[PDB]
Symmetry: D2
Subunit: 300 residues, 4 copies
């Protein structure tokens, strides 16, 4: 039987994720939302594109969690002062997870809702799922923006640029230029220190840069691509090495917390958390980031 | 030098078309709109997804027609009572074409704006381009919905279903079940007459079906996929046989009019208009459709 | 756990089938052969291409059947006339089938129809899970000649046909279209007749050119597409060698017929409304196929 | 008008390169060879697979150089030691180059570096448009062994290396990473040393297995990726045999170095900060390459 992917929240990120996934013909897709008509319409529209692109994937829209039963992967993209933001997203996340988790006990849950690290922590607590199967998408998106800026500046193919980073988005991000390369060569060999610093800065503010341009909306093409790549990693058991929000039990000196770290991602979800040897400067950035993430967790 | 694709109108259809195209790595894409920030933001967002998907295509947003200079293909997706609709879209189309056409004299123009046939006619008149290089996208979308419904009903792969039709959307559509097959076998062998009639009806109202579900918006995934397939046909010179709005000079007894007909589409745009031998019933449908299209043209 | 595909026979068709399959990243591939070194070498070579093309699939070569255990699909391309191939086929299936009880077997060896029938008898598998590849290849050649003649995209040409290869083939120009439009609308009767004849002799044409070898690119592509249909349950409508129980008036025999191919193997055998002319061709073909069976 | 790719030499590497290229639908392909029938047969066979895979590219086989006219890229995979291949290379380039003055030539024949140098001399083409494929293949093997050992996706492993094949290869583990992370973090020193050695002997390993043949799947994939880099101006960063004018302290010679490959061919030669240990290896390798050149 085909793999089954359920996407909770048929907004810009959710429907765009469905688009990236359908074209890959990875499995059947279920788009769920609380708003009537929206998920059914977007699903049917995407589905009607199948004869043109040539993919045989069933794309259905629904308002009933019963249709997400026995999903292999669950993608949560239903999220919406700072304390109010947390409360609002916590209620939505709790509601989404408590109704979906029980119907797909063997599924891997991929959270996209912000505040990312906190919501992923909540999703694990509410689902009761083994920690390795509840992860958050954040690092892959930030790393993609970073890689795009590098390829653009260096004048090289985006396929030959790799990068690893940690933490969350914005101020919570932990950039690691030392761990970025172009075909195995340090990026510091292609880009001067000052320009590289500008690129790191642009990466931290990357999400806001899109917001300031759209005025009334946030990014969705890259966030969905990032989310889709993680879904593919699990379904095809590719063992991708990427930065994802995972539950830590001592790594980097952090415990009882979800934090963006390097992992091997496969069919079993987080199969391994890599512990990189960070220098003094890098640890300073990680500690500052960990602090902010911890604060958000405490508020939650 | 890479091929260059300019998309006029960075709304739902325009930006989604860019998405389908970027993933195919067909050429550099320019997204233009009159609204500041929107095209730049959507382009940058899509562009930042490139390292994840692995495509090396430059995706830029702009408000200046100067950036669409020397495009190989121009896609127009900037369109918005019935007489007022025509007037409104005619002004937009005229404005878009008069500013873009002169900067890309060798380009093929693919119109998507409604009323499709009329706007394509206007685009040809305003551009002064040879008629074979100014076509409209309509038939491929309707045929895709038709094919999707058949594959779904028959229980077969969407890759083995083919269909040809004529006319425009809705009431102007000319369904041709006789010219639809599953791996060379007439669909009438898989689906009873009554169910087939229902499918034809659903196809005629296919666009409205999405509208009634979204409430505040029309379809874009399939329309963009249909538009992208036509762009690919031209750039790769694939000689696709598909229904597109083309300028007729006697075919089917029609003259001085853009109408949805079967054509061979390649690098030179419309390389041949096929003349199918229609039976009495089919001709009745074509004449009724031609009449409505002519009326719209007269109003214009 | 990824899907598992075992290919018995690491020659031209088998290794090329591994190539088409690997690029699609459909599952892990096992290449088996009786010649030592050959499968290990070809598998490793294809495996080393993975970082360049970006596919994550294990390609392993072996001489041990134990490695093909729990395969989802078994492709047999090890044939070398009816005696030689029958012994080879019986040897391959008897050792493989027991280790993968839930697999779908796709036969490619010639004589195709008879060997598929044999594989079904030897494996004890339900008839719907033992099929042969033949029609997809012939149709592919036919579609190529049509596209070339009409000057249209190969993606817009479809065709159905029945029977076996060459003289046993049952052409059906009537059941071939370009974007739903009859091919008769693009190509005149005499030219169409020459294309059908070239289709009948398609295999021989390649042999006459290569001299020492037989075709493998198209045959392998045809086989891979069938494998994909099964693994993704795409329900492709294609001509394949299937076990008939009355369809077309034929019983107890494997014959090339149109089917809906999915995860359950042959999920449905289509019954085309053949006219008298087309029915005569089928009867003659069926007779030749039955002869091979009786000899078997 | 689609791009045009001509492949001189329709053997294992050449025909397989046509396969990888066709599936990508990058342009029309011409397969040329001196043996009659062989290229025509392989081209037709691959062409007949087009309706199945859905690619619209003409694949034509020929024995006439006139058919390779106006190619955007010319791939040379016709080599058969320095005398034999030199005569073959001179024969192929002298007839092809004049008919496609704007083409980028990609050499695959061995000895790679010397033959690329010869092709440059014979064609009169700017040095940036005459390159050889060698490093992409070795790096591919290295990346495969790393992925396999670390147990990670082959898409997340990158590596740079220089020089030629086997003993002339210049490994640079220091310049290899997994998602930007040094491979040294995943694989210990002794195990890494064994992987480098297996990389040096990679070609020979396939030959010892196949017995009568040499590798072709990976070599062809490596060649196709370079062809793609040029046709789409992707600006890939890869090791290729390029003409040096002082870089690394080397002059008047073709040597495997890291370059940015695009439509203009070698658009830039990268100068890596090699330590003393790595510099010694390069000097030794350069010496062996120069020897081949002097003999040439
Ligand atoms: N940096 C990133 O990776 C990134 C980028 C953009 C957005 N995001 C996050 O993704 C989430 C969605 O962003 P968006 O732009 O797609 O938003 P959106 O407003 O377009 O879509 C959210 C959808 O969730 C649905 N929804 C709300 N409550 C629900 C419930 N209880 N059950 C099911 N569906 C429910 C809504 O009706 C809506 O269709 C947000 O949490 C946002 O912060 C992350
Ligand atoms: N049946 C089909 O194939 C189909 C399906 C859907 C929509 N359409 C048609 O496609 C067009 C766009 O639909 P949409 O849903 O993407 O709409 P939309 O409102 O999302 O986007 C239209 C975009 O055009 C831009 N625009 C307006 N005037 C412009 C001008 N003079 N120059 C440049 N840009 C301008 C707007 O600012 C807007 O971003 C419409 O004409 C619509 O009727 C056809
Ligand atoms: N007309 C068509 O549709 C068509 C086209 C091509 C090939 N074929 C058929 O496909 C089969 C293979 O063709 P090929 O060109 O790849 O041949 P080939 O000779 O290159 O390869 C056959 C492989 O089978 C192996 N083999 C033999 N006995 C075996 C056994 N007992 N167990 C395991 N492996 C064994 C050989 O060692 C060899 O590597 C043949 O039966 C041939 O007739 C049909
Ligand atoms: N280590 C590597 O990176 C590597 C791997 C494989 C092959 N190679 C090299 O690639 C080349 C080809 O390898 P192969 O395995 O494909 O060999 P092959 O023997 O299968 O094919 C070579 C083809 O060249 C043709 N040929 C000979 N002289 C010709 C001429 N004057 N004009 C046109 N065609 C001519 C032959 O007829 C033959 O079809 C060799 O030089 C080999 O050393 C290098």
């Amino acid at each position: 039987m085909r793999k089954k992917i359920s996407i909770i929240g048929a907004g810009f990120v959710g429907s765009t994720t469905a688009h990236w996934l359908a074209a890959k013909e990875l499995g059947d897709i279920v788009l769920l939302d609380i708003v009537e008509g929206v998920p059914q319409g977007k699903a049917l529209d995407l589905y009607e594109a199948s004869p043109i692109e040539g993919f045989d994937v069933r794309v259905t829209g629904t308002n009933n969690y019963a249709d997400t039963a026995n999903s292999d992967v669950i993608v949560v993209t239903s999220g919406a002062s700072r304390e109010d933001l947390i409360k609002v997203n916590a209620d939505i996340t709790r509601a989404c997870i408590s109704q979906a988790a029980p119907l797909s006990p063997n599924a891997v849950i991929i959270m996209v809702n912000n505040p990312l690290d906190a919501m992923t922590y909540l999703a694990a607590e509410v689902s009761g799922f083994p920690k390795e199967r509840v992860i958050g998408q954040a690092g892959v998106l930030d790393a993609a923006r970073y890689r795009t800026f590098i390829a653009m500046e260096a004048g090289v193919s985006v396929e030959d640029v790799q990068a690893m980073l940690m933490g969350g988005h914005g101020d919570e991000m932990v950039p690691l230029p030392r761990f970025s390369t172009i075909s195995g060569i340090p990026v510091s060999e292609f880009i001067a220190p000052d320009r590289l610093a500008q690129i790191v800065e642009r990466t931290r503010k990357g999400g806001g840069e899109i917001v300031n341009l759209l005025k009334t909306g946030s990014a969705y093409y890259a966030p969905a691509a990032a989310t889709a790549q993680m879904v593919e990693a699990v379904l095809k058991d590719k063992k991708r090495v990427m930065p994802v929000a995972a539950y830590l039990t001592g790594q980097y000196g952090l415990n009882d917390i979800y934090f963006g770290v390097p992992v091997i991602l496969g069919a079993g979800g987080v199969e391994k958390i890599l512990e990189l040897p960070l220098n003094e400067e890098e640890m300073a950035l990680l500690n500052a980031s960990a602090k902010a993430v911890r604060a958000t967790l405490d508020t939650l």
